[PDB]
Every structure is written in C-alpha cells, then in structure tokens.
Write a protein that binds this ligand. Structure first.
Ligand SMILES: [Zn+2]
Length: 422
C-alpha cells in the first residue's frame, strides 16, 4: 500500500488485455455464425431464409462491435500515454465566467469530459442506428429525433447528475477517514429514488405513455395478476415504434408497492397476440421468487468491494500532483476524488471481467427459474411460441458460442430456454 508504482503501464496493459479477451470471444462468435447452418432443436421452427438474414444481422453486429472496441481502446490509450485529462481540466475551468467559481472544479472537468465522450461517440451511435439497423428495416427514427434525444440525455445528465455527484463528492470531505459506510448508504438511497424517479418523471419525456385500451388483453393480464397476486397498479402501452421495431415488456414499481406494467407498442401489434400473457407470466416470475431482492443484495456486495479497495488508492496518483514536482501545466491543491475514482475504475477491469461472468450467470439462472415458473402456471406452450416469434422478428442469434454467451448473454439461448421447458 504505497504511491510509487508504474500506473501508466499497468492500465494500458489491462485495457489491451481485456480488449483482446473480448476480441477472442467476438471472434469465436463470428466463426460460428458464419460457418454453421443448422440449429438442433430449432431446425423445424426457423425458416431457412429468416435464418440467413439473422446470420447477417449478427455478422454486422460483431463487425461493428470489434470496430467500436478498437475505437474505444484507441482513444483511451491515447488519453493515457499523452496525459489528456489535465489539459481538459484546465480548459474546463477556463470556460467558467459570470465570482461564481468554486472549490469543486471537478464538476466542470466532468462537464466538458462527458460532452466530449458524447461527440466522439456520435459517429458510432449514428452508424448503428441509421446504417446497421436501417439496413435491416429495424430503425424507424429521423435524425431530428435522434439528436433531440441526445440533447435531452445530456441536459438531464447535468440537471440531476450534477447535484447528485456534488453531494456524493462532498460526502468524502465530511468523512475523510471513514467514508465507506456513508457513501454506501448514499448510493443505496439514490438507487431507491432512481427506480422511482426515472420511470415517473424522466421516461415521460422520451415516450408517450397511454393506458392500455380497455378490452380483452386488459382483462387477461388483470386475471393473471389477481390469480397469482395483488401486484398491479395499471397497464400502459408505450410508443417504442418511434425508435425501432424492437419489442420488450417490463414493470416499474417501487418495491415493495404497487407495480405498473409497461408494454411496448411493437409488442401489442401483430407479433404477439395474447402469448403476451405467457411472457408476463415469465416477467412475474422474476417478482415471485424475489430476484430483485437477490439483485440489490448482490449489487451491494459489489459496491462494498469496490469502495473497500478505493480506500487504498485515493491517496496519490502518477498524474497531476495537487499540492514544480517535475512536469508541466499540472493541477494543484486538494486531491480531487472524482479522478482517483476513474483511474481506479480502469484499474479494476479484470475484477469486472470476473463479476461480468458472475452477474451474467445469475441473470441466466433467474430466467431459467422464471420460465419454469411460467410452466407451473401452464403458459408453457404460449411462452415457447412467444420467444420463438421474438427471435424471428428481432433476428436474434440462432446458435451462439458457449463462451461468448457465458460472458455477454444475460438471457439463456432460445434453444436453452426451450429445452428447459419443451
Ligand atoms: Zn426474464
């Protein structure tokens, strides 16, 4: 536990290492998608034509994935070896006029930084939407709406992100010796408010929430709810058609309290008729077995590990000194917590890989249990046809690499979800 260790080399080595590992995964997946032509348990229920089209969708996804990784590894390594952070700090504070200048310039640094991460990402985000998924008729948005969404995301990020971060940072000042349990509780309470505030206040700005047109489907879902429990405030059908013809469904409720069921516009349309309910049995499965409880708990362990280790490396950095020590246009005074946190974030990357395996696996077995639970309710045959139709219209990957799926896939392979039931 001490200051002088070669940080530059280690961080560059880690980023390259885990990029290479991720490149290996993506490589295997590309192999299988291009070579294999048959699913074992889906050889009858997958059109030979819509199978090839799905091979192509996944191909382009992988290609773009690798280019996106190289791009994000390239700008990082350049950011590192050329000490690009100090420079942004100076340029940020320089653009602060009105005095209303303060001790927490950290917010300024992050203000310009995140805005740069946006503009540098912009080209990729544009390609993915207006090329990768326009080529497969998935994207239904105009540039007008895309840009407006970007601006709304940044404006919100500052509006509520600034205040929360500020308090988060000043909590370190009040407790320089024992901050752990305080910032722990802080993140917990922000989490609770988060799941309650984003759906109620933030989402309405993105999509138009309308209540489910009273009739058949409303009654069906209402009946499944009353049967298995009392968790149901109301049902809304969001307009997710405006973005792309992708489908999904979820419920938003502050647990444990009333829960609202949101259904995607493309879902109620003619892809899922009332196999929709089998799906909702699956999604009620997550609630019944207290998975959300297991997830917040497994999340708190993670956070504790992270900020337990933080105590070790929030003292001295190779980068600017903060209280001429041997290099140029450096930054001075109080050590700034935000910076030590970021570099620490890129120090952990291997730990994250480990917990990427762990989290992906837990989610997978949660889906397993929810499906089995849908069988318990008799929605087995409809649930099967639901998942199959989703994979058909979303051109999801048919036969995947075990390792690649073990790392990335939070949901088990379709074939793997069926064999557990069918
Ligand atoms: Zn699920």
């Amino acid at each position: 536990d001490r200051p002088t260790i070669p940080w530059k080399l280690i961080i560059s080595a880690f980023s390259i290492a885990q990029f290479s590992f991720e490149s290996y995964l993506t490589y295997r997946q590309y192999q299988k998608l291009s070579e294999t032509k048959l699913p074992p348990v889906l050889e009858d229920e997958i059109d030979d034509e819509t199978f090839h089209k799905s091979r192509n969708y996944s191909r382009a996804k992988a290609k773009f994935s690798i280019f996106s990784d190289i791009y994000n590894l390239a700008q990082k390594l350049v950011f590192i070896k050329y000490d690009f952070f100090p420079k942004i700090w100076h340029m940020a504070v320089t653009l602060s006029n009105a005095m209303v200048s303060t001790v927490a310039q950290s917010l300024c640094f992050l203000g310009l930084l995140s805005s740069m991460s946006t503009l540098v990402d912009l080209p990729l985000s544009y390609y993915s939407h207006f090329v990768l998924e326009e080529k497969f008729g998935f994207n239904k948005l105009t540039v007008k709406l895309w840009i407006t969404d970007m601006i709304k995301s940044l404006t919100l990020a500052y509006a509520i992100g600034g205040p929360i971060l500020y308090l988060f940072l000043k909590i370190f000042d009040k407790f320089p010796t024992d901050f752990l349990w305080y910032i722990m509780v802080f993140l917990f309470v922000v989490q609770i408010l988060a799941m309650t505030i984003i759906p109620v206040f933030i989402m309405p700005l993105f999509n138009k929430f309308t209540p489910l047109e009273d009739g058949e489907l409303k009654k069906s879902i209402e009946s499944l709810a009353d049967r298995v429990g009392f968790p149901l405030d109301k049902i809304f059908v969001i307009d997710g058609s405006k973005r792309s013809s992708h489908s999904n469904a979820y419920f938003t409720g502050l647990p444990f309290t009333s829960k609202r069921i949101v259904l995607f516009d493309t879902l109620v349309n003619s892809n899922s008729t009332d196999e929709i309910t089998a799906v909702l049995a699956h999604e009620i499965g997550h609630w019944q077995k207290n998975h959300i409880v297991n997830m917040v708990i497994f999340s708190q362990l993670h956070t504790f590990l992270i900020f337990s280790l933080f105590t070790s490396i929030y003292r001295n950095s190779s980068f600017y000194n903060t209280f001429s020590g041997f290099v140029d246009p450096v930054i001075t005074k109080e050590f700034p917590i935000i910076i030590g946190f970021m570099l620490f974030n890129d120090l952990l990357t291997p730990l994250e890989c480990a917990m990427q395996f762990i989290m992906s696996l837990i989610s997978r077995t949660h889906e397993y249990q929810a499906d089995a639970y849908a069988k318990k309710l008799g929605y087995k045959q409809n649930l099967c046809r639901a998942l199959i139709d989703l994979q058909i219209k979303n051109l999801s990957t048919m036969n995947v690499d075990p390792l690649y799926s073990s790392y990335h896939y939070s949901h088990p392979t379709l074939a793997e979800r069926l064999t557990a039931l069918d």
